Amino acid sequence: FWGPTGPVATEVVDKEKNLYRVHFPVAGSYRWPNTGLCFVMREAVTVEIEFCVWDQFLGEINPQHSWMVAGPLLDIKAEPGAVEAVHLPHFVALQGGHVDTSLFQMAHFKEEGMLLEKPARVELHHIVLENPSF
Amino acid sequence: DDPAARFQVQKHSWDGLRSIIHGSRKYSGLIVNKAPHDFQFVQKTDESGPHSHRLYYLGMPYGSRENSLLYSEIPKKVRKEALLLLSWKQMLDHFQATPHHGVYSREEELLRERKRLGVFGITSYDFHSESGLFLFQASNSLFHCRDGGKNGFMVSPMKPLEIKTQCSGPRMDPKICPADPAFFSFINNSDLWVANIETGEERRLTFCHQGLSNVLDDPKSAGVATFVIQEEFDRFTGYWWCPTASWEGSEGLKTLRILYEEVDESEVEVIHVPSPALEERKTDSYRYPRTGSKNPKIALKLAEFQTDSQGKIVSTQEKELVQPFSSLFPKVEYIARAGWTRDGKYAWAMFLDRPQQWLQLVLLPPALFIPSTENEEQRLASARAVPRNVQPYVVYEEVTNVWINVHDIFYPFPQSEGEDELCFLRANECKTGFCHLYKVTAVLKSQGYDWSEPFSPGEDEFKCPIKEEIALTSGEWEVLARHGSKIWVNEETKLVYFQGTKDTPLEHHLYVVSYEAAGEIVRLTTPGFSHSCSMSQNFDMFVSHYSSVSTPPCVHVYKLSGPDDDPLHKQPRFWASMMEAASCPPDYVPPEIFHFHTRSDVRLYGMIYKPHALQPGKKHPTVLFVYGGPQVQLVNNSFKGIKYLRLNTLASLGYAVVVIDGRGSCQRGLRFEGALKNQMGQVEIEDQVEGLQFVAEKYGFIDLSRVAIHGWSYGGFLSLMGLIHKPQVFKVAIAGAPVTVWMAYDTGYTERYMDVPENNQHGYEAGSVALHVEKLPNEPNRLLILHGFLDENVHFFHTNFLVSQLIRAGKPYQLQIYPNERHSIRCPESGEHYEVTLLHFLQEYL
Amino acid sequence: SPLGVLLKMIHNALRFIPVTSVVLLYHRVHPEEVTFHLYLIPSDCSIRKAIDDLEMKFQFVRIHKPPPLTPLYMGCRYTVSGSGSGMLEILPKELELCYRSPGEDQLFSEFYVGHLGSGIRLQVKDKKDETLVWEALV
Amino acid sequence: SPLGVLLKMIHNALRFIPVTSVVLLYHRVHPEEVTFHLYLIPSDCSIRKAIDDLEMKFQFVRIHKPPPLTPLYMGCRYTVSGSGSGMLEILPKELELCYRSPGEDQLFSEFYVGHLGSGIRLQVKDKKDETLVWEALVKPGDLM
């Protein structure tokens, strides 16, 4: 979908890779229900997105059951410095209790390895990140 | 006293107890991890790439079962305050490192029993830096690969190249020649071979094993560490490459020496122990040196060979010392360790005598070894040919009144500065009572020897006097030497990195000090944990695999960083993490450490597992788990879940589990360890009993009327000593694998913590529990004897003779055999039976 | 680049944190017997679309039942029952909500119905304390 | 006597053991009869695509394959029961999960039933305790 500009479907290049491209012609975006998530960028832009797989990134890490997958493992291809928020689909537990908001560990991959950034803030069903979204 | 205030354990069915053990198993699999080990740092030397190093190590990814060679990429720059968890990239492409269902050769399974390697896969590998060569043994066949030397690094995994051979049998113990990485060496049929990777040419070097018949009739081996050396002195190789290449210069050729230990085990007692193939009903002979019997006749020897630029072993030559080894070195029973000085000038060796109160380090220069031929005129000829000046230098001589623990720390410096007078580092426990490093400078003053005539050495014959012995550490703590710990000596910054117990006896911390002056001892690890560390050869960054009594083991990668002018105060900053801390299971309660003081006012440490769902007021049945013997410390601030989950299972059924290290347990110095000297088995139980009465007073849930004492090796021996000498306190005794007669156990252990039976008759009669069987209880179901039938360390004879003397004294028992397990119950099904039998026995009769 | 969500949890003890997402039953229109598969998935439409791609390769079509309204705890054992429990042949007695990728096939309960008709009652219940969390008539 | 801790219990059970059931359920509609191949191979990821390609060029079909909830412990054979075994042909029953390299055809269980009809039940359980490792009934709906 496309938030402020009305119905514009995200371009898919092939079903078997699950790649989703768009060009934003507008400042600002709205939550996509098909992705269940939202990134906001304040100008016209190309972005490519992947929903790849968590298994070939986390079975390569040993205490993987000292974590659980709680999201889609986004891959993003945009120019650096211009994305100003990404919202990842958090799965809620704060409606109940016994969950800390501070010890949360966002997974920023590189070919180096897993990085565990500290997220800026957690929503009910998303989290917001800072501008260097790689 | 009060049956309304004595906790009753719920009597589960046998299938219930299995259900409990399986629920431990499911959680247990996640808890066990087989942490990465055998780290090898290699720089990337690029200054424009992303990765600063490549760390190579052994590990199991968990995708598969067998542990394999892997690597991580250590970057030049971490993003700060966001931890880097390393990718575990595979060198090899998911092949079987072991054959189907764990079948090995009998000598491979024996070597894995001596090293206690329970894990499957590439257990050990060898590495050569400059060539980037990884030589390892997979599926009883040597393999190799190369990663980033004169070649480049990789990002995909490769195929491990197999090494083709004409030799029939396993090729054990492979080592790359450090001087020439194209050449390597291995043991085949207890004889030393040498090969060359790219051309495939192999070549035997020793001829001590005729391969004619059984080992009762073919007794000479070469390059093989024998039984007592493998299982009590923690040495598994018996050959050491010379690290440098010398040139004898015929026209262009290049010599390559190897020091090896020839062993003639003919005059040592042979015992038969049942083979794993029970259907065949045959045994295996084992040259097992019983206490008091004579040890193998040992000797050091040089197997040299000479090669060319085309890469062929042209010449070869066995060499042996100018006099026989036993005569040139009287009072030398065991070669504890050996190797070479890094320049290649001398081959060193730690000798040790039969009382084990007299250890001495010796340097053997290669010219002392003449060729070996049966022609006695060629022998005299080269006895004339060896120079008068050259000499073995007994450099260091430790003498003690308790026993010598073998400390493998020995760092000989290069001595080209001041061209004599070797300066080395050496751990010395006998001097002050605690294992401390020293810098020692001896003076190699040769007096001149005629090696053709045979002389008798004196008592301080080759002993060089000491120039100086500066003490780099001191205190009431020790520097860790044994059990494969080591030091790391940066000679450029002139620092020595060691491990020690300086902060507390319960924790192993990495310390650094300078060997110019003992200024201060800088700790490089966080307190409250215990650390197993491993440095880069460039001394810029290390790994530490560490844990605590509460937290599981993690493996963090630290980076030494600071102003280079002050290397001693370089701050270790956490760079990245390799294997982060696992999940403790929800039923797992981490145990409580305590300490207390005896009537002699010595401080003993102990653990306790509290009963889960503890009810105040209620008194509980107490399992005193025990080892209590030397060279093992049960109580330390370290994760007791991956190896002592059974203790938690007991706790989860409601048993108090108490663990005490009484006097004898190591990492607390020689005077502490030496309270069992010639009365081993006798003093430990008083320390364990006093630990019960203290824990009974401190915590109010210890029922003295229901005490079980469970042990497995020396612990099972003590559990039986507990039931004999303290019958009113210990209700039952689950004695696994017990050492029931000391006179039957092997030399290396017994001859060291007691001595030869002619010397200590009262100590042997009071310590062999099978000779004290009349004092066991007349009541039934108070004694459960467990034993692995195919045992080679604590032979089945021990349990058999105990049961024999129980029969003769008319005393009941119970007994459980594990017909296929050597010394640890290895197979998980057999281990599950062991645990359900332990729970059942406690449930019913405690 | 790849980016991933927070999934830190803890190491000391259990939490079994609840999940937000949906539980989905898929259908068949096969003439001999009609087989339903009841899945237990913790994620959203992209993982569902990957499952859709697999199921499309093995001829499934699906109607969208409403989501659960109580949060359901990750990895817990949830007995599945139903009106067709016992009188029709269905459901292995157990189910975990643990995540695995669509590359490694998901946990599911078989349901032979014969005629699809309209639809019959289903149940899901926590094995810990026997609480119904979801039903949908299909 | 250097303390064999003797905790042991290293089953090292793999999460591949659910997808070892996926290798399970190969059937072939070449004749009027229908028959099955059963495989349970952990300790290699490549065995999936290997036995997949091998048995579709050997003309077999892949079925639903419900996964065991428990990643099964290695070193123990698992028996086969059900309404199928004892009425229509199954050549071996028990499966030992042992490793072979992916380039080799493994041990498999062969299962002939002739005509299919309403279906027939196959079950995989343990002989150690007789708990349910795996349980399903075959489809007449996932065929050509």
B5 in a domain, yes or no? no
Spatial separation of the C-alpha atoms in residues B819 and B822, rounded to whole Å: 8
| Cα of B365 vs its chain's centroid, Å | 29
D1: Cβ contacts below 8 Å, ≥ 6 apart: B629, B713, B714, B739, B749, B793, B794
Residues B153 and B19 both lie in one domain: no
The owner of tokens 């002993």 is: B463
CB B639 within 8 A of CB B553: yes
In this complex, the residue of A61, A64, A115 whose CB is nearest that of residue B79 is A115
Q: Which residues, listed in sequence order, are joined to residue B463 by a DSSP beta bridge?
A: B394
| List of chain C residues whose C-beta atoms are within 8 Å of the C-beta of residue B584 | 11-13
B270 in a domain, yes or no? yes
Parent domain of B374:
37-579
Residues B529 and B676 both lie in one domain: no
For residue B70, give the chain A residue with the closest CA: A60
B827 at interface of D, judged by CB pairs closer than 8 A: yes
CA separation (Å) from D135 to B306, C93, D95? 67, 10, 15
* Phi, psi angles (nearest 5°) of residue B378: -55, -35
Residues B566 and B662 both lie in one domain: no
Which are the catalytic amino acids of B?
Answer: 713, 791, 823
Are D6 and B739 within 8 A, CB to CB? no
| List of chain A residues whose C-beta atoms are within 8 Å of the C-beta of residue B580 | 63, 66
B6 in a domain, yes or no? no
| List of chain B residues whose C-beta atoms are within 8 Å of the C-beta of residue A66 | 580-583
Q: By C-alpha distance, which of D67, D56, D47 is closest to D27?
A: D56
Spatial separation of the C-alpha atoms in residues B296 and B227, rounded to whole Å: 10
Residues B594 and B539 both lie in one domain: no
Spatial separation of the C-alpha atoms in residues B543 and B578, rounded to whole Å: 9
D144: Cβ contacts below 8 Å, ≥ 6 apart: D29, D61
B4 in a domain, yes or no? no
Q: Is B340 helix (H, G, I), strand (E, B) or coil?
A: strand
Are B61 and A112 within 8 A, CB to CB? no
Token pair for B178? 């450090």
CB B235 within 8 A of CB B345: no
Q: By C-alpha distance, which of B677, B699, B823 is closest to B752?
A: B677
- Which value in Å is the resolution of this experimental model? 3.6
Spatial separation of the C-alpha atoms in residues B347 and B561, rounded to whole Å: 36
For β-strands A113-117 and A45-51, DSSP reports them as unpaired
CATH code for position B67: 2.140.10.30
Residues B615 and B755 both lie in one domain: yes
CB B693 within 8 A of CB B658: no
Residues B341 and B435 both lie in one domain: yes
Are B586 and C13 within 8 A, CB to CB? yes
Token pair for B822? 């050597």
Give a three-class secondary structure readout of chain A: CCCCCCCCCCEECCCCCCEEEEEECCCCCCCECCCCEEEECCCCEEEEEEECCCHHHHCCCCCHHHCCCCCCCEEEECCCCCCCEEECCCCCCCCCCCCCCCCCCEEEECCCEEEEECCCEECCCCEECCCCCC
- Is position B713 annotated in a ligand binding site? yes
B808 in a domain, yes or no? yes
Q: By C-alpha distance, which of D74, D111, D80, D108 is closest to D94?
A: D80
| List of chain A residues whose C-beta atoms are within 8 Å of the C-beta of residue C74 | 68
CB D123 within 8 A of CB D132: yes
Token pair for D40? 């349970």
Q: Is B776 exposed, middle or buried (0-12, 13-18, 19+ CB in 10 A)?
A: buried
B1 in a domain, yes or no? no
Edge-first strand order for the sheet with B358-364 is: B334-340, B347-352, B358-364, B393-399
Spatial separation of the C-alpha atoms in residues B401 and B670, rounded to whole Å: 10
A98 at interface of B, judged by CB pairs closer than 8 A: no
Q: Which of B13, B17, B33, B94 to mutate against chain D (most D CBs within 10 Å)?
A: B94
Last residue of a domain, one of B530, B561, B579: B579
Q: How many domains does chain B have?
A: 2
C58-89 burial: b if 16+ Cβ within 10 Å, else e: eebebeebeebeebbbbbeebbbbbebbeeee
CATH code for position B637: 3.40.50.1820
Chains A–C, number of C-beta pairs less than 8 Å apart:
128
Spatial separation of the C-alpha atoms in residues B494 and B539, rounded to whole Å: 11
The owner of tokens 């060796």 is: B349
Residues B815 and B686 both lie in one domain: yes
Nearest CA to CA, how far is D1 from chain C (Å)? 34
* Phi, psi angles (nearest 5°) of residue D19: -90, -5
- Residue B518 host element (H or E): none
Residues B176 and B260 both lie in one domain: yes
Edge-first strand order for the sheet with A19-24 is: A11-12, A19-24, A45-51, A74-77
Nearest CA to CA, how far is D108 from chain B (Å)? 17
Are B580 and A117 within 8 A, CB to CB? no
Last residue of a domain, one of B548, B579, B610: B579
Q: Which residues of C touch D (CB under 8 A)?
A: 28, 30, 32-35, 37, 58, 89, 92-96, 100, 104-110, 112
B126: Cβ contacts below 8 Å, ≥ 6 apart: B134, B135, B136, B174, B175, B176
Give a three-class secondary structure readout of D4-62: CCCCCCCCCCCCCHHHHHHHCCEEECCCCCEEEEECCCCCCCHHHHHHHHHHHHCCCEE
Residues B562 and B704 both lie in one domain: no
B420 in a domain, yes or no? yes
Residues B264 and B308 both lie in one domain: yes
Residues B130 and B217 both lie in one domain: yes
Chains B–C, number of C-beta pairs less than 8 Å apart:
11
B828 at interface of D, judged by CB pairs closer than 8 A: yes
Give a three-class secondary structure readout of B440-467: EEECCCCCCCCCCCCCCCCCCCCECCEE
B365 in a domain, yes or no? yes
Are A133 and C3 within 8 A, CB to CB? yes
Residues B714 and B624 both lie in one domain: yes
* Phi, psi angles (nearest 5°) of residue D77: -80, 150
Spatial separation of the C-alpha atoms in residues D41 and D106, rounded to whole Å: 8
| List of chain B residues whose C-beta atoms are within 8 Å of the C-beta of residue C12 | 550, 584
* Phi, psi angles (nearest 5°) of residue B42: -130, 135
Q: What is the DSSP letter of B7?
A: P
D20-59 burial: b if 16+ Cβ within 10 Å, else e: bbbbbbbbeeeeeebbbbbbbbbbbbebbebbeebbeeee
In this complex, the residue of A61, A65, A108 whose CB is nearest that of residue B30 is A65
Spatial separation of the C-alpha atoms in residues B303 and B750, rounded to whole Å: 34
For residue D12, give the chain B residue with the closest CA: B29
Last residue of a domain, one of B544, B579, B614: B579
Residues listed for chain D: 144
